[PDB]
Amino acid sequence: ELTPDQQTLLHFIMDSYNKQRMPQEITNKILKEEFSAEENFLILTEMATNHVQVLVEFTKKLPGFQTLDHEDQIALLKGSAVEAMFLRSAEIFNKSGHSDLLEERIRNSGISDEYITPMFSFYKSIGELKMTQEEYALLTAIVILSPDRQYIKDREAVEKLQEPLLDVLQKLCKIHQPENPQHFACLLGRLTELRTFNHHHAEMLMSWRVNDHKFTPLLCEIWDV
Amino acid sequence: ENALLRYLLDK
Ligand SMILES: COC(=O)c1c(C)nc(C)c(C(=O)OCCN(C)Cc2ccccc2)c1-c1cccc([N+](=O)[O-])c1
């Protein structure tokens, strides 16, 4: 279990992943700020925007990513943004006593329950897998380097960067959870659950209590507003 | 197109 090049590849993913943190001035707003729908929405907005900064930073350092066509690199970034961002938020909800105040801000932010409800099911669903940091990081690379996104010119080039990340992730599922032989398969299933938010997202973008807000620049650009 | 995302990728 563990291959020299696979360790090298993992160490490289982790160097990059651990750099990615939610800034404390943002989390302080969760505790400090006035409680209403507008101010709550503004908070989530800042956090979403930060999701993108971090994931652009991660995407950039991914092994092989600079060797891809400049168009294709953008197609993968915009392609994976929604999936990637929800995943990161789930990591930052499951892994203090602030989850509670954040949840309450989320549920009193003018977003209707048809979106909020499966956000939280997903968080529970992924939280039951008890994933290590290393599993999260590889999953995130696996999502980001999906060959199945809209507009990719050279899909096979993307495939050949994704495949080794799946091989490593599978070994990590044996290493971290040997008790649970169906654990890797179970992570692939949560990716199925994760892809459903591409439709939940496209709808919200449309919705009146989501379209009549002016999203930060990075947001308008990544989400094709 | 995508000047912002291009800037952020090349830094
Ligand atoms: C401001 O919210 C949006 O308009 C939005 C859009 C148009 N698109 C995406 C992809 C995300 C999104 O990525 O969520 C992640 C939740 N983030 C924003 C907050 C958070 C951070 C850490 C832990 C929990 C939540 C968010 C979003 C989407 C659906 C449901 C919710 N919600 O339940 O709060 C938010």
Side-chain angles (χ1 to χ4, degrees), chain A residues 154-222:
Chain A
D154 181 359
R155 293 166 190 282
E156 288 163 19
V158 180
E159 283 174 56
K160 65 163 176 48
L161 304 178
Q162 199 192 43
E163 204 186 3
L165 301 171
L166 286 151
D167 285 333
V168 181
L169 176 57
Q170 175 154 40
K171 300 285 235 301
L172 295 176
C173 290
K174 282 284 133 193
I175 290 164
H176 286 290
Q177 285 201 39
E179 24 156 349
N180 286 337
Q182 209 183 332
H183 177 68
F184 175 66
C186 277
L187 298 202
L188 292 172
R190 299 322 200 269
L191 290 186
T192 300
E193 295 179 36
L194 177 59
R195 296 183 186 94
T196 65
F197 287 91
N198 292 291
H199 81 259
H200 288 143
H201 171 76
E203 297 199 348
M204 286 180 66
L205 259 56
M206 280 179 186
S207 272
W208 182 245
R209 267 87 229 279
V210 187
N211 68 31
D212 228 16
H213 300 101
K214 282 142 290 107
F215 292 127
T216 62
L218 196 57
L219 288 180
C220 309
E221 294 279 281
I222 192 96

Side-chain angles (χ1 to χ4, degrees), chain A residues 22 41 44-45 47-49 51 81-83 85-86 88-90 92-93 102 106 109 111 115-117 119-120 123 197 200-201 204-205 210 215 223:
Chain A
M22 178 142 70
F41 199 83
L44 306 171
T45 282
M47 284 171 187
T49 170
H51 295 332
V82 175
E83 283 167 31
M85 292 155 80
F86 272 98
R88 182 164 110 103
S89 75
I92 303 169
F93 189 77
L102 183 53
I106 289 157
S109 55
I111 287 167
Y115 308 121
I116 310 309
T117 296
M119 200 189 51
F120 283 103
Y123 297 168
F197 287 91
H200 288 143
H201 171 76
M204 286 180 66
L205 259 56
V210 187
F215 292 127
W223 285 338

Side-chain angles (χ1 to χ4, degrees), chain A residues 8-219:
Chain A
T8 287
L9 183 74
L10 174 173
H11 285 319
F12 202 93
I13 298 270
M14 295 317 148
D15 281 351
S16 190
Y17 196 78
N18 296 328
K19 130 80 214 166
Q20 311 313 337
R21 292 134 189 182
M22 178 142 70
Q24 254 220 257
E25 86 152 72
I26 297 182
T27 59
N28 284 348
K29 286 151 211 263
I30 298 172
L31 309 175
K32 166 157 56 225
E33 274 282 325
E34 251 65 356
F35 193 100
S36 59
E38 165 81 64
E39 273 111 307
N40 280 356
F41 199 83
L42 269 141
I43 276 164
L44 306 171
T45 282
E46 288 180 69
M47 284 171 187
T49 170
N50 182 250
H51 295 332
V52 189
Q53 283 177 5
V54 142
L55 298 157
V56 173
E57 268 299 315
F58 181 62
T59 302
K60 200 164 51 154
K61 288 297 210 269
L62 256 33
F65 189 84
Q66 308 316 319
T67 79
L68 305 159
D69 184 278
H70 282 9
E71 301 289 302
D72 282 354
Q73 30 182 77
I74 296 294
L76 302 166
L77 240 208
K78 302 170 74 156
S80 78
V82 175
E83 283 167 31
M85 292 155 80
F86 272 98
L87 190 56
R88 182 164 110 103
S89 75
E91 187 187 6
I92 303 169
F93 189 77
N94 295 331
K95 298 156 66 99
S96 2
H98 310 178
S99 359
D100 292 296
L101 188 43
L102 183 53
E103 172 159 5
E104 268 40 89
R105 285 196 192 276
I106 289 157
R107 292 185 179 287
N108 300 267
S109 55
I111 287 167
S112 82
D113 276 12
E114 65 209 295
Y115 308 121
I116 310 309
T117 296
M119 200 189 51
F120 283 103
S121 310
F122 184 64
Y123 297 168
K124 297 201 198 65
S125 179
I126 208 91
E128 274 161 15
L129 297 169
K130 323 253 218 187
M131 281 190 301
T132 67
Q133 210 206 2
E134 307 197 311
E135 286 156 77
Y136 268 106
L138 282 167
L139 248 69
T140 305
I142 287 159
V143 160
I144 292 164
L145 297 167
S146 180
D148 301 309
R149 305 306 176 181
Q150 297 169 333
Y151 317 125
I152 307 296
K153 292 181 283 157
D154 181 359
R155 293 166 190 282
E156 288 163 19
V158 180
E159 283 174 56
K160 65 163 176 48
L161 304 178
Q162 199 192 43
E163 204 186 3
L165 301 171
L166 286 151
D167 285 333
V168 181
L169 176 57
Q170 175 154 40
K171 300 285 235 301
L172 295 176
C173 290
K174 282 284 133 193
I175 290 164
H176 286 290
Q177 285 201 39
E179 24 156 349
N180 286 337
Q182 209 183 332
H183 177 68
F184 175 66
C186 277
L187 298 202
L188 292 172
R190 299 322 200 269
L191 290 186
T192 300
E193 295 179 36
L194 177 59
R195 296 183 186 94
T196 65
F197 287 91
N198 292 291
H199 81 259
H200 288 143
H201 171 76
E203 297 199 348
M204 286 180 66
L205 259 56
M206 280 179 186
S207 272
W208 182 245
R209 267 87 229 279
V210 187
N211 68 31
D212 228 16
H213 300 101
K214 282 142 290 107
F215 292 127
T216 62
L218 196 57
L219 288 180

